[model samples]
Target chain A: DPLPFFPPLYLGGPEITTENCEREPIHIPGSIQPHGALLTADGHSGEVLQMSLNAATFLGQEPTVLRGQTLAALLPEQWPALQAALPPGCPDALQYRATLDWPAAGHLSLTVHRVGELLILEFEPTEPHALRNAMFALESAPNLRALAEVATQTVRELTGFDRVMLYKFAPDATGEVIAEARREGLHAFLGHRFPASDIPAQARALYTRHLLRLTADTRAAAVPLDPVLNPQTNAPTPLGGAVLRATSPMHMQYLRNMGVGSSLSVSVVVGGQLWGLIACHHQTPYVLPPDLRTTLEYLGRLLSLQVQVKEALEH
Target chain B: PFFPPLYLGGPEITTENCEREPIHIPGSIQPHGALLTADGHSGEVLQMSLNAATFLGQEPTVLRGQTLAALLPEQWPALQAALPPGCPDALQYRATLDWPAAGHLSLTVHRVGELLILEFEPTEAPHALRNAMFALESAPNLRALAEVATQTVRELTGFDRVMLYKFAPDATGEVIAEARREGLHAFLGHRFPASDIPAQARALYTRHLLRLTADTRAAAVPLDPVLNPQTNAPTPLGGAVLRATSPMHMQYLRNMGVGSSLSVSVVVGGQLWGLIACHHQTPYVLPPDLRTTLEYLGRLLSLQVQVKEALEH
Candidate 1:
């Protein structure tokens, strides 16, 4: 049920609002962030069907064998699991922290999902991890202020963002920065108001379901998918389930205008609905390798489960 | 004995045939940033570049003997506190000067011998610490670590090519990890001769830790008085950011089709362990703020490299 994380490109004018922003297809983005490489293969034969063309991009050296190689050959240690159960094709939920022939002291997050008969695997480097203690801290926050504050502080240190804010959305999608953790000397955004258009309805829908979203670099050029149409599904590759899906052009422009270089956001859901986001912002190009991002994703889920209890107590 | 640490003079170092030259005493710096030397005891400005009048809105001569406390009365307190008494290492600092013009300068304060050294450039948003922490601690081995580091370097500075070169004891360096654009020729696993990087450059690498040529073809700026007025000779650019590369080094870069280049030394166990080399095909000037982060990363990488080795052994 986890959708891909949509970046929280917050704090902009009415300029971010438009019919063009709402209708732009946010799912079929044929590209991904520059930090990770993506590949899709035949689920049955494990033949590599499509991949982001990059030995220089992120896959680094020896990955150009994408066309000539099979998923089994590329991922020898991981192939056994796919050969047996094949992960059943979930959203961005089926992923794991892995040690690859790669190479992050650089660890990597190996994300797996399926778009029809094709099994997609994404590998992105991240720094490193633990969220169990964080989960416990969120469960015990004394009040709503502390609850949001705990989430903000936890995400801030965990991801190393310059600023971390817990932004709660009003009934109409407008939001307020209810709690925050930030770098010293940085302009504070706590209790700041944000218009509804900042997170368009289309993007908000994804936020409601996805556990986390990351915008690695605002100025990084979007990398296009190798094949626009996946022959396996006979349609445009709906990478909504894939973690490295590209951003909408309007959102990219909005993020750049926000003057942020990178952003990573974790959803805070309560009562089975989107309540707020634990949004992390950095002022320079940054990529939170997959292993650590997954840690945040888990933290998001744990916060959602605990927030429900906290809200129930207030009621 | 050690025949006076072999030095090479400039305009070019190609003729290693000189009776030993002093490239370190270039009496010049790259023009993008400004440099100044002050008396370590009084913080009294001893000498400065002629361009300071245009950059900081204070004429070089007028500010020559003026104390930093007088020039920046508001920030002097914080600035002085940052410059620890008998500071053993360099300090990265920032201050905004509202003079004849508004100048928010990134200042690097250090003591290279008896004189206090300070370099100034436009300020930028500070680099994130955890990102560096994440990089240093997370990876399991040395190779994996370098691979991740090059990606991080390229991401921050937007270079066309970034490679990690492991140096042999004799000084030959091998490209152990590389992240490059598709068009560039592959250098991964290739070895360059030890003579390619002379003893002088190696010594400088260890001293500075991080160095860059924003545009190899850009002309260098000479010190106003051509030497320190007090010392009446070249004060070493040993730890400064804006030191100019020798003309022969620029030629080496040009021959490689490079317009800009950067180097971040990976010192391990107090030895020149390796080098992180970056190249851009076209002229590109990386912000000093980002450069600040890279230098810090180099320091952290030093610790990480040592740790990774011990674990492997």
Candidate 2:
């Protein structure tokens, strides 16, 4: 029973009028609402199911678009392609963002799903610049190289990292730099190979266990231990003893040799395994603030999905 | 020979006064089955019975002076035969032997104590093994799940090796879960080299929901060409082509020293996500229905994975 209760539960209620919508917006706790919509449709036997005004506008249609309409009719093109995937059938709602010609709906991320024969599509749209960069970042690249190139270019423009690279792991615990973006004087790690044991299996398993956004100051000794820390195990050291014992000495040494003092990596879990590391190695230890971490983690998830999609489409 | 005194008047001990006590210990609820009580301190034989003679396919007179090991020699014979040229640990063996007239018997021997316990019962299907595995999915975390997975694989597949091959984001894999057959060298916690599967092979494995090679040594079935060249999707392996004799695949398997292999693709969000790999040392063919059942189980595992990630995230 405890095992099944892990994932968060959210329920979609009936649609509301603009008057009611403005007065009482359905709030989902802890959810980041960068852009959103509420769409309503008829449920079983033509009963009214959902009611959201914002979602209706995103499709450039009325809330009635979902009435009696299946998801097959809403996004015919995308649905058919997805249906061809190995394991057929999926949950009700689809979450994706796209650019449109309509002025009111130029850039938007939509979440649509079928409920009891009725379809519900929620939309979240933002300004042109916000839409332009994110869309371009995802579309400008076809393969990992092009994708990483654009990503590195974006990183350089955004954070000014001295260098950025796409580090890939080999079967034998070794790693190689596949792509790199760097300052003119920076030496390229491209084609350089690390030892196979550099990343041990346990360490890799731990990596897949999280969507980490590490920062430089994580180990800067807390002024006061957060209440979260168990008082019983008030070991003053942070991971000093535990990490050393669990981590392979050889792997840690290899990381030190790479000149990676301060780094942040956002794990991308595909099929519950750690595919590879999105290593943002820095010469100095850096701590990614919560806001930045969230952004990067989101980007990492989307990036992984993009890779899977691209791979499937490849001949 | 020695036996614990059965006091007629003792606190908290009373023999049931039913309609009548069966003289021959037949149809009685009391624990009675060629009962032998040994010394708590020493493992020296302390008791015997004519009924116990039935277990050894001998007469009661022949079993009176015999030690437990002599009475049940199946376990000893198995352990001695199982030992390779050099086995480090003390020799040990456990086996279920079927007696011609006496149903089923489980015998276990210990070198340290020289204790041989022979448990006999009527032949019956193993219902508990299946139930134990079905209950293990209740484990709260991956560590617990892995433990249960390993145990279940050992019980059901009866193979030399069984692994839970979880897929990584990039389609690479790691042996997160493992369970080996008894008496075999344990590959416990051993990391399987990733190159065991290449990108091309990984892609193919992920594409097909399930693949079973009865004989790894047999030649591989050639890739069937797509009926429409314009479409990248290759036609399913032709039935006759797959049925064709292929000693080459068998040879390859034999060369690798692997008799058979079975893998099931785990799908998440309707996409090929991970795999459950089973390997055998002897030529093994996974029946179609079993393969289908495994695929369904793989799907359940995918759901479990989703649940795991959701909670951890």
Candidate 3:
């Protein structure tokens, strides 16, 4: 499903290779995960400009039928009302959560957001204590190390990940495991350092944009974007903000090397820059339901704020 | 801002104690009950108290990541039935695990997110689920109800003394009503200026509608891995059946000359109204069935309490 040798999908879209993975244009990956569908619409006109090739499977419509249709025609009823009721716009992207009907996926999670005149829409298959896990994980951490430790444990317990590691980046961008909670049989990766090339700058940049990511099944092939390029921009769709954007092949291959079947990555962006990641791994295919995705993202946000405050307190 | 090491061994301080306390996840389980935290789906044991070996017949390290079903196959099916569908932030299932070795055990299951907290305490015969739905619909004044409720709790719990401790708007708590054995010291009408069960302590009370300190002086039994091997954090014991008592609180209990204590929080209209403090002179184990009875009573009292407060204050 990957065209490594295709023409530039964007302005400087480098064909991803093991040798030049550092410059791969993953933000314009030209694909999305198979578990869900994606679509791009003209923010002003509401016309479906482009969508994933599998978008029709979810709606039970032909790709051709959906191609030029307006959001009003697609949803047929709530599109106009939803737009009128939207509270406000983010300077970058603002997302709303709703349960919407889909013929194939059943009632699923639908998120809407507007990014620079492009109304981005994503549909994902459908899937907590009170404040038990959050307050216990965040407020209870006696020290900063204690916080990371509890955060890792809470995420693993909360998400059923076999292994959850908190790795911090050095000033040079190399990373090492500072804390880990994992299944007993797995060999420990705690305190192991990784070379900077393991997570190159570009992928790190995308992690900042989309704080939480999931690779549900590394073996499943990623489906392609319909045209492989946005019709209006004449380039691959920028999917930095997408929930289901396909992982770079090199990154997927790295998971395979570690014998991981599934993974979730959450960036710890402290002081508006990437600090580290709380990486979770599973030995079997695992999909995080829509609700957990929100929680995992919130966990990242909590860690980021805690670290920023801790850093300032020490200073 | 205390390091965990400072509190790991029965420790406390002045104001720093409240600010730095992680009361919910106290690094271990109270020794009275053995606990196992696991993945609710696969029933994989993530972390188990070291003392679990006494009940499970296997070392905790040996059982880590192993399915709880592998140990108690009889109760596993019942547990699955009790775990209701549609995820609640937190839920609980009270059941009996008839361990082949021991007699029937009082097993309580707490489902917090995906983590299933299975805690086992002893029972004389079996887990008895009897309902005591007595309704005193007649409107009595707040103190009149409080006095009667304290006596009722004292009788059910077998604790020698029970106090209806109510909090004021200033957070100071007063022993509004009391019931005790003939020989116990009188504590009624005492004014505890908040610090006795300080802000941080009262704060944890709301989250835990029922907090049990089965043995004040008993050492906490650590979870095998100490931290969950997957997340490196302790299993959060928010309302956990076997949550370890805070070291500071344990010390406080020792000074109070109480061997065991249980506090069933009385909440009204989403605020912490007060607590039903039950204290015993000897290490007393209040079985799981009695705890369930108290929880039901707490819910019953909240509505009446709310109306009574409205009429007067």
| Chain B TM, per prediction | 0.86, 0.47, 0.88
Ranking by TM-score: 3, 1, 2
Model 3 residue runs over 4 Å out of place are A1-14, A81-89, A310-315, B1-313
Which of the numbered candidates is closest to the native, going by highest DockQ?
A: 3
For every model in order, the fraction of real contacts preserved is 0.00, 0.00, 0.00
lDDT of 3 by residue, A136-227 (tens): 33644547787888788888888779999999999999999999999988898888999988988777877775677789988889888877
List DockQ for all candidates: 0.01, 0.01, 0.02
Cα deviation at A306, candidate 2, in Å, is 1.0
* Candidate 1 runs further than 4 Å off: A1-315, B1-12, B18-21, B89-103, B125-136
Query: Of the pair 1 and 3, which is ahead by DockQ?
Result: 3
> What does candidate 3's lDDT look like per residue over B50-129, in tens digits?
88888767754678857878866877876676564453434565656667766878777766666777888887550011
Where model 2 places Cα greater than 4 Å from the true spot, the runs are A1-132, A213-261, B1-313
- Decoy 3 TM-score against native: 0.51
Question: Best by TM-score, which number?
Answer: 3
Q: What lDDT is reached at residue B77 by model 2?
A: 47
- As a whole number from 0 to 100, the lDDT of residue B202 in candidate 3 is 71
